[PDB]
Amino acid sequence: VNEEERLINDLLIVNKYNKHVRPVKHNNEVVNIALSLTLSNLISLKETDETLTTNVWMDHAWYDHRLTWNASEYSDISILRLRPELIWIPDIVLQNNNDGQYNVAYFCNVLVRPNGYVTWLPPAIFRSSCPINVLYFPFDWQNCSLKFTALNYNANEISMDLIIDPEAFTENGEWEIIHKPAKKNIYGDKFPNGTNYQDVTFYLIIRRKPLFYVINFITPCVLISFLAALAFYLPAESGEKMSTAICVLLAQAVFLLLTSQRLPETALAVPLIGKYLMFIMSLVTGVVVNCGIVLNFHFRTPSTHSGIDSTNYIVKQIKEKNAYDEEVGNWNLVGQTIDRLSMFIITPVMVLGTIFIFVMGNFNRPPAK
Amino acid sequence: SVMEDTLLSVLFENYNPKVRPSQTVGDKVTVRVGLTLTSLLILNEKNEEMTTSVFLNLAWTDYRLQWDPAAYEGIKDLSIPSDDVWQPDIVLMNNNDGSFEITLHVNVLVQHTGAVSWHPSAIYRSSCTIKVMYFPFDWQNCTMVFKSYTYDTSEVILQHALDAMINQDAFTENGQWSIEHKPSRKNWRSDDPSYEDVTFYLIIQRKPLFYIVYTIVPCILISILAILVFYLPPDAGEKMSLSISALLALTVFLLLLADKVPETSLSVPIIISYLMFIMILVAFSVILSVVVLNLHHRSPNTHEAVEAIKYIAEQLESASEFDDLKKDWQYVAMVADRLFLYIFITMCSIGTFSIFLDASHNVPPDNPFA
Amino acid sequence: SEHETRLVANLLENYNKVIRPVEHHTHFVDITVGLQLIQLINVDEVNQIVETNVRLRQQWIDVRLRWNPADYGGIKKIRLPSDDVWLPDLVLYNNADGDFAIVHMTKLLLDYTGKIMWTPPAIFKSYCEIIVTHFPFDQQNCTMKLGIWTYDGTKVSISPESDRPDLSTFMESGEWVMKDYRGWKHWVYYTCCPDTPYLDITYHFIMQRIPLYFVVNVIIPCLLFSFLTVLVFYLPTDSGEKMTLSISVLLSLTVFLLVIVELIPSTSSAVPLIGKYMLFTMIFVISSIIVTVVVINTHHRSPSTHSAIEGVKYIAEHMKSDEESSNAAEEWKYVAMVIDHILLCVFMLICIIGTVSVFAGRLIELSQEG
Amino acid sequence: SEHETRLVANLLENYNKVIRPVEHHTHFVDITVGLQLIQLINVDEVNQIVETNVRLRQQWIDVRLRWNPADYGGIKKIRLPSDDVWLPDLVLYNNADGDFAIVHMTKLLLDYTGKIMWTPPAIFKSYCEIIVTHFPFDQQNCTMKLGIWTYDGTKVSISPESDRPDLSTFMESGEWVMKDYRGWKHWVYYTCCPDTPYLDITYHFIMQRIPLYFVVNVIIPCLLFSFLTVLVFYLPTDSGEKMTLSISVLLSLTVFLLVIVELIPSTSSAVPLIGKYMLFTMIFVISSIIVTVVVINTHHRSPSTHSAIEGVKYIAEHMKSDEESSNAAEEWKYVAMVIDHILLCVFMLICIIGTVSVFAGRLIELSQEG
Amino acid sequence: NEEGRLIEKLLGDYDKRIKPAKTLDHVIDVTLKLTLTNLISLNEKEEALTTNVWIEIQWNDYRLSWNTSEYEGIDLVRIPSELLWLPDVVLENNVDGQFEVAYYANVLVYNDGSMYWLPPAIYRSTCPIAVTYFPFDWQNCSLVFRSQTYNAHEVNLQLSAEEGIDPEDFTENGEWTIRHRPAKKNYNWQLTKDDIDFQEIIFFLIIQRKPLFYIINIIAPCVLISSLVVLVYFLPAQAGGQKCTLSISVLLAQTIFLFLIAQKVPETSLNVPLIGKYLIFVMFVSLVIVTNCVIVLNVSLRTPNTHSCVEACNFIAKSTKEQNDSGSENENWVLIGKVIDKACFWIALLLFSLGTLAIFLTGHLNQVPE
Predict the structure, then answer these.
(1) Three-state SS for E28?
(2) What do you get for the CA distance between the two ends of chain A, in Å?
(3) Cα–Cα distances in angstroms (integers) from residue D111 to residues A124, D3, D13, D76, E149, in the given order
């Protein structure tokens, strides 16, 4: 009380302080600003639309050359508080990731160092348009780029110089955060004939992959498969249930197509890479073809698909005769062909089924590289 | 200090907050408008709604803010909030589907003999005439009209940047879509004394090539089952039953296809064109499945005294065999062959048609994007 | 300027914004409304809500705003922003689904003398009658009343100018379609209070529905299913060896009819259409049902069916005869004289029922067509 | 009257709001608080959001508020508007999802003294733990911490008060139930910085969920699909003559539950759960499949069953003797001996992984119940 | 008349936040009442609603009975809302969603301290309706609302019509209906132990629902379904033996439909309210139908297989005749359906009982609250 009341009447923030004038110590280079970025939370990830809603601690530093203090201000306490109006507030802009206005990181309570230096560093709920592309889905899952800084001012009114990541990871990400570099810069552009405003460039290289699609997704391919699989086993153990062998193909067939239907649905959610989508469809087809081949080659076959003596001789004549007919049917049988069929089904199960987990493994050896 | 308090003080002595940057009724003050686009986030193709983001660059000259020694010669460039002046407001006649975000009331760059620069990026909710005419490979057409929303050009004048600026200036790389062009034509609506709006054209091009591909499967795959079920009949005729299971199934299938489609045009719908004839191709393997069914229908049956016994015998077996031999006569498979090759005509003709339509669609209505 | 500064300052001083133009006990404030819906953006059946384009033409007079060469002198009639005014609290009685869009703080025009207009560019949220009777082909007239909030005719009075149709500038992106709309004036005094309360503009929207794409999809499967059913009868009489064959059928069909019903109740639930419209699909769709059921139970209906070396040949021959008998029993079982009767039995029924169906179909096509 | 105006006037002249009441380099601002939770209107399951009300009882002092017979004299404990006060920015760390609803602009309890409290019926949306391990049968205790935000220890101070339980105002309409709720205080300095940061109240909610509705209906279609598969096995014994029938019911059964699982994905992601759980239905339902896999593979298990006048009568009966031995050789294959073992085989297998399901089920609730 | 001077007089003296108070211990008397006008959303699973309430506000402040120039120039007055004491309204029991445009509406002065103000408010709320209010006997929705603000020791509210409704401005987009509406005026001190009584306003609302449309949505499926299994029951007496496979197709189809009805509507009661009563008849009626339905096949499943040299050779052939006869004959005896026929009438009455037990009891729960 040290002449306190009285001195913060001396200085007058708003009245002695030019609020409409930038205390730059008059005409020189700038007042020297530094930004610090610390994510407090990531609440939602969108793949389809390249958009992320995340929370950041907007740690900000810059010199107020009119905020040098004397005894009952500096010393009384080397550290005090002061509201947003008693307060030049910039517009740090999330330059290319602020297609979603900054919230509750606008004009809240700031920290008043004891000789100008000021410190304002609260919470930012924001939305961003990160470098997704249809390619942030290959396993690398890329590097998310973001730049932060005071938008308005030039390299002669503004200079911003420059933490992890998993400080406050959203554990309820389906993805995984590998890394997180941080390096500032300053930059001159196309349309501006000056250099200027400096910025916080923070690249986020991540990776994602639930442990829960694997589960229900591979489940139905071995399931399915075994239907195609079993389709051909059963035409041996009895291929005369013709209608019912058939039914199965209607059945396995409708089941296969909506399967893949739920596929593009989560799809649109999120733009799909070309890596995964081919092994699926290229192979399902694979089957498909061989269910249609199953068809024909399973039902192809046209069939397997003294006057008392004169009289009973007619019957032994209708006898033998229709025994060549009857036989016309077993013709169709083809049972020395048995083992082959199921054989020549096994060959190709082993070629495809392997071809896939073969492509598995040839891309599951190089990343372990 | 070089008469700082002095300039500073004159300016705030002769500036008028509430006033127009003009001296009575000419002419007015010739503002420059020109937008550097950032990117676009969402094309609500269905409804014709456009959410994008750009910079609002405005710039004109304030003869009221010519400085002198210390803020002129001092520092020829100084940043100063707005608030002070006539700002654009602007609505999009069409468009203007909703507010401005970071557009207005943001600081500005003020030059010495009063050139003003204002550099804001913004998101804006717009909706243009993309229509239900944004899917024919020929694509279309739109009007994007920007302009203020009580101000009738009479105290100022609007003028743009380029006219070639393109619309593939900031075309979204992410787009499964594409960029023909965007011109820019200034207009003044004579139905009004007010000088209004400016019309910006969308010659847009939409070719996301990803799932039509497996859409091609259903057209070819479906016919599989088709060729199939018309290749089953004179293959094993005792397809009798199993036949109808084929089609319960074949039908329900192209139905559910009609389930999904209306649901996916949901966000998304246009020109039946694709739909229109695969619908036809639909009604095709409907009615052809059903006729053939009729084809099956068909068959109006099917669908001593010692020698006196012998005789008896002789008659019993032969007698009824030619009667059952009759039915053979009544369902011989002459049709199956001829109509399965009527099936040949019907289906390799209808197939090579929408294959043509399709052939014609990709090659013919492409070019006129100009 | 012509009185320039002396102009401006005189005016702020002797003038109270807040004050309402109260000119002895008489005419109140005479203020008229005039809505011109430039266009409409969207409308929801389910939740009878519309987002539309209105330019509100508001008139009234302040005799305190007549002038000399120190106000008029300066510049004729000018542009004066709102604020200084008394602004009626307009409200769509049974509408008014929220607050007028961009209403606040716009501008208006004063004459040298006084006369003021406030005609600003609104777009807002509305609320109107649809009733179960709007999805009529014949429509319902949306009753919408407008007028001064909480001020009677003593204190002030909202009046009319004005008849105009609705289809004057109706949304060209409706699916849908108008007949006419008219608006007449009225003064609502209440049985409450012996008093004279405000005045009101009552809108009447008379418009009928249905872009015709929907319509097609749904009815053609019903004709499609006609033919199947058609087989369903024909198949069986012509051979009941695939009885369970058609079992198929009956299952996969009624489920179909089921699935249709999911689609149009949700849309029910999603869009109110006058209920008695649905018993059309009712009986109709249901007879497909009662027909099946019967036809295919009955298809089943049937109990049945759905020297001494000489006398050895006659004990044997006598075994072939009795069973001769019996053969003919069970075929005697499935006759093809009467399955013909059920055929024409119910087919006549169907072109009864059919023509009946065609009845309400044709009937409110006699009232729509107009 | 009693220094009326001189008392009110003096209090606002030497009253300021830029300043907070802070007392020396001290014990911080003695902030008191706890609980008044009486309603939980909405909380989601799927997202672990909670919009509840709690009147945040605050209590502290500021010496400067000491008075004589000209403020205490008056009226003891008068109640000031909230405005005048420097309110703590309280928030649910983790959480704080919502704006606190109804806090601004209040009533504040003053005494002649000193004593001040304000009970604000704050309602807000929250976000706390729960995870994948919340809805187990062994529970989870949502951690909810509250306290000032960007102020550590050396400035400012809060402390929890009192023991009251959770099931104090637990939702009685809860598909669910609480067991206990504890809140203890603490101060948080970090390893980062040598400074004393902020103070906080940490709640923990311990309560089990699920009402049983869902339960009674999940099981049912389980039991009843098990019956079918139980039929799947019985059949072949009773009615092997319908083996193709038995295939029927598998296609049946399987597509049905395949289908049940669709639902799940939609309702699970729409109310999230520890995976752990489904692993039950998993193998017990893969069990129907795995079992039709083996039982009908096994069903089909068997390759093939899956003088001279005197002379010809003997060429004829000889025709009959050749064959007769031979057919014996297909029936030879289906002995209907090891069909009664596969049912028993698996009757015991299905009695045991059916008591299985009933097992983890009950076990887990021997562990819940506890 | 003094118009200027009188205004200027008391605006010397004029105090805002201060109640026209003899003293601060014995409060004002305030008048309130509400006329419903809109019941926007009835979310009963989640027991909340939104209504446009006419907040009839009235109270006395003689801080302004007038003389000469006001009372007697105009017994009536329009002076701004924002000029004095106004109570913050809210439904202690309901108030769920802050007030909408319900405030900042010009207030009505008398000239002896009569004060009246109405206005309209759309807001959220929280009435009964958990798992009951479904029935025929309605749940009384009890909403008490007061001032948020202060407690009854310096405020004191008055009330209305406890007796007389409801459908003054009931929503027509009810499937509901109201049959009474209570309203009394009361004090604050509850089960919970809260003192300092803050008056309030109780709003009882016992209302009806159930103008049933879906009724027969529910009604038809499951009559259809009982006749569908009536075909399953009578068509087997008529049927042959190839009707095993027959029957089954039916049961597949039968419950594909069944459950799909069980998925449908369960959903329904989740998204709107809940009551078990009706719930319980459907599923469980539906389950027992199923029950017996496959039991039925286990009833035509049962049964093990019904599911000279001249004379040497004459000797053996005349045995193959008698012989195979005996065997064939076996099947005869074995499947002479004494079981089946009666199993028709077994289910028949049983079917009847099911039917009846249900519809009968529905005929009752409609005929007691009839």
Answers:
(1) coil
(2) 70
(3) 39, 18, 20, 6, 18
Range of the domain at D250: 213-301+336-368
| CATH number for D14 | 2.70.170.10
Tell whether E76 lies on the interface with D, counting CB pairs under 8 A.
no
DSSP E138: P
- Counting every residue written for chain B, the total comes to 370
For C300, which of E101, E238, E257 is closest by C-beta distance? E238
B85 CB-near residues (< 8 Å, 6+ apart): B21, B62
Q: Which domains does chain B have, with CATH numbers?
A: 1-208 (2.70.170.10), 212-362 (1.20.58.390)
- Say how far apart CA E215 and CA E115 lie, in whole Å: 51
Structural tokens at position D325: 């031995």
The set of residues, in sequence order, having a beta carbon less than 8 Å from that of D359 and lying 6+ positions away, is: none
Question: Would you say the C-alpha torsion A124, A127, A132, A138 has a positive or negative sign?
Answer: positive
Q: Give backbone dihedrals phi and psi of D243, rounded to 5 degrees, phi first.
A: -65, -35
d(CA E205, CA E182): 7
Mark which of C208, C239, C255 sits at the end of a domain. C208
Determine, for residues B235 and A299 on separate chains, whether the beta-carbon distance falls below 8 Å. Answer: yes
Q: Count CA atoms closer than 13 A to B318's CA, side-chain side.
A: 10
DSSP-derived secondary structure for C127-149:
E----TTSSSSS-EEEEEEEEET
User: Which CATH number applies to A213-300+335-362?
Assistant: 1.20.58.390
Of E150, E283, E309, the CB nearest to D307: E309
Residue range E3-208, CATH number: 2.70.170.10
d(CA C134, CA C208): 7
Angle between helical axes of D338-368 and D278-300 (0-180°, round to 10)? 180
Give exposure, D17-29, as e/b (b: 16+ Cβ within 10 Å). eeeeeeeeeeebb
d(CA C42, CA C35): 18
Domain boundaries, chain E: 3-208, 215-301+337-367
> Looking at chain C, after which residues does the C atom sit over 2.5 Å from the next written N, breaking the chain?
306
Number of domains in chain D: 2
Residues of D in contact with A316 (CB under 8 A): 312, 315-316
Contacts of C299 (CB under 8 A, 6+ apart): C236, C240, C243, C246, C306
Tokens of D68: 């004589």
Structural method:
cryo-EM
Cβ–Cβ below 8 Å for B297 and C234 = yes
Q: Are E206 and E147 within 8 A, CB to CB?
A: no
Mutate to test the interface with B, among C246, C252, C261, C319 (most CBs of B within 10 A): C252
Q: Around B227, how many Cα atoms within 13 Å sit in the side-chain half-sphere? A: 16
Name the β-bridge partners of C83: none
Distance to chain B for C134, nearest Cα, Å: 23
